[PDB]
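Posted in: Structural Biology > Protein-Ligand Complexes

Title: Requesting predicted complex, zinc ion in pocket

I'd be grateful if someone could produce the 3D structure tokens for the following input. Sequence and ligand are given below.
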Amino acid sequence: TWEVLQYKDSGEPGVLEVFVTINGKVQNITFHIPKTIYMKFKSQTMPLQKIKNCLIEKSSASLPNNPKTSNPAGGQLFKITLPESVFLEEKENCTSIFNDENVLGVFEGTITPHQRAIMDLGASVTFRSKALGKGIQQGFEMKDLSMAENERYLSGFSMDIGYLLHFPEFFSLFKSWGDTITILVINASSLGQIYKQMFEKKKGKIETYSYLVDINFEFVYFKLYRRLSQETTKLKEERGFLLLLQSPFITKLLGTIRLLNQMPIVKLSLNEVLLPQLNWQPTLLKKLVNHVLSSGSWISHLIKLSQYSNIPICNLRLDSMDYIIDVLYARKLKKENIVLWWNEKAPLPDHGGIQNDFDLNTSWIMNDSEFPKINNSGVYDNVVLDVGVDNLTVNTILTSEFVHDAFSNDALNVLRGMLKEWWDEALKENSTADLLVNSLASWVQNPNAKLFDGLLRYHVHNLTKKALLQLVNEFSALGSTIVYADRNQILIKTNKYSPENCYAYSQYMMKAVRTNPMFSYLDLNIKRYWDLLIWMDKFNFSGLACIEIEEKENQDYTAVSQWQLKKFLSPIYQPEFEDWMMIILDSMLKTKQSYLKLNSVENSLNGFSHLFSKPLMKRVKKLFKNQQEFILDPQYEADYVIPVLPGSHLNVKNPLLELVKSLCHVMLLSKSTILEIRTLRKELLKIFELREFAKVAEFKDPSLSLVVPDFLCEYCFFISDIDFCKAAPESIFSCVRCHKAFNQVLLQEHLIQKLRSDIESYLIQDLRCSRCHKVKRDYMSAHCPCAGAWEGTLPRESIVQKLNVFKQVAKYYGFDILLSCIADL
Ligand SMILES: [Zn+2]
Ligand SMILES: [Zn+2]
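-- Reply #1 --
Done. Output follows.
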């Protein structure tokens, strides 16, 4: 039995080397792993050319269901096990088996012997030869003798370690058994004090992880650029150990020093480190000290992950969780009879070479990532429950030929069983299983992970939408009304009137929802209770809310006012807007309380504008007179300047008109006191010299919408949309739950992706006739057989306006890359 530390292919095909730990110290052995590919060659009779030394067998494995490939045709799939050397020497010639007629495509031609060994053999490798010397002087062959033993423990770790770091001239080194520190081109005292202070800060962690790595050390701050080779050589000839590497240029540092290829190295890339241009010494000292004194915890976590995942030490990374999922799923499918369609250095599934061709169905199924939502405006005097749904994707996965857009159900069932055992193991005190299940969704979304497929993503998204609509239907079965719906938030109207009487009601509804077999894995949390709500949009609402209802005590009520509409008013009328909004909300609360104390119409609110109509009329008259007097004054023109904000498209002149229009449109959401509001609106419009049904007296949305779907926060594995026009700042740049700043170039890149996808979608549209709405079914024709000329499904003005709003968004923030993206058109 041997614990493998690293797998690595050589420069010779079919040859591999491993830094392995024999009973004594570490040792390197030469490995030989052959190649295996999948072929669909000829229909049933083939030019065998069997004189070439290879093993050929016909199998009945499962093929990927390419939507373009709707024709089964021949199905005589073949298995080919063939050494890489003969593969390379026959690739030069043309008249060979791999290149002939009726070659449909190779399915497993990109799996290097590195991957084949790392998944087929694992870290726990041994010998059962029963020629050891002949196999140790040469490379010992595997395909005849190979088996994996148990790996519940890797080895008792007592070895030296190495440190190599770079912070973009900040080359760094440290030795576990050394007692000196030198930094390449006040500092020493700061180094000592920071070491001591964080030593008492993390006494406990240091004591726990001392057995992995073990103290004060000397300080030095070092023509000089050649000493890296000298240090690496002296470390090589002084000790045989593992090296911790941390830099944004891992490959460059590997290529600069040739001695690095001779030792087993673990990479710990945490890149994107920068300097503050001033006072860099303490921040770099903090970085170095936390790195060196948290390397123990880092290596402990790596050891746990490796000794659980049956993968060697050097093949794992702290953030590379997708790789473990890929290797274990591929191993399970290899034990099955399904082709892996594994791919490298390309974010596409391997379909035999067909995948590189453009196709309409595929291009439609990649770019349809928008998630619909429900919003029913209105004013509610009833109590409303704000609930949150969690772990929806995992529940959707676990719960639930003719169709060409169907994903292979065999793989779906395999991954469902995988996730079921994952859930069971995570239940029984397993942090690794819980973290992996959490990262499953991010693995599903991310195409950078290998073994990716767009069909599976589309299938999962469709099933998630169906599950959400089923949940809405279930919530609608009892007495309830859906105000807003989303992947994360659901607002439900409760028939009752007092929040204190909805304790058992809400608890019973949550219990009944949870007990349903379809929704057994949902986590439901209630956040807020709404006494009185004025809801018109996600970013536009106001009402009185209580956090959680208490017993024997009146609840603490706090009013909220979130109105992005207020940002489009003149800087002189916004105080009036907020004051009048507070006044009307107070009046609505007063009238509802009076109605309740008394006992499509609801007398809870009917008759609320009677309290403030005359003061409002007088205030509007005074505002109109003051605006008339002080609008053309030069020094008084500061407060009448109309603000400009991205997404704005309305050109208006008189700010008081928009003030009263907003103040009336917020009222017009009642849907039960419409006549009173209309009379008040007419009376207000009589102050101006306008009429009831004029176009200038019609309210519109002063802002457009530009939403980026499914932005991922790695710090939470959290999925939500983001509105670049309507959402306020300090929320575009940070996650909703965690307050961690987003990376800006990712935002700009996703915006560019959205714009390019929009352009392609417009260019790939279909043509529809004018009178009848039948689709154009001829590659060339003047017009419809009946009367009428063709028109496109996507109009030009829509995409023109979208490009305009992209310009506005790119101009408001500092986005140079998006500006250059537009300028190249
Ligand atoms: Zn977050
Ligand atoms: Zn027609």
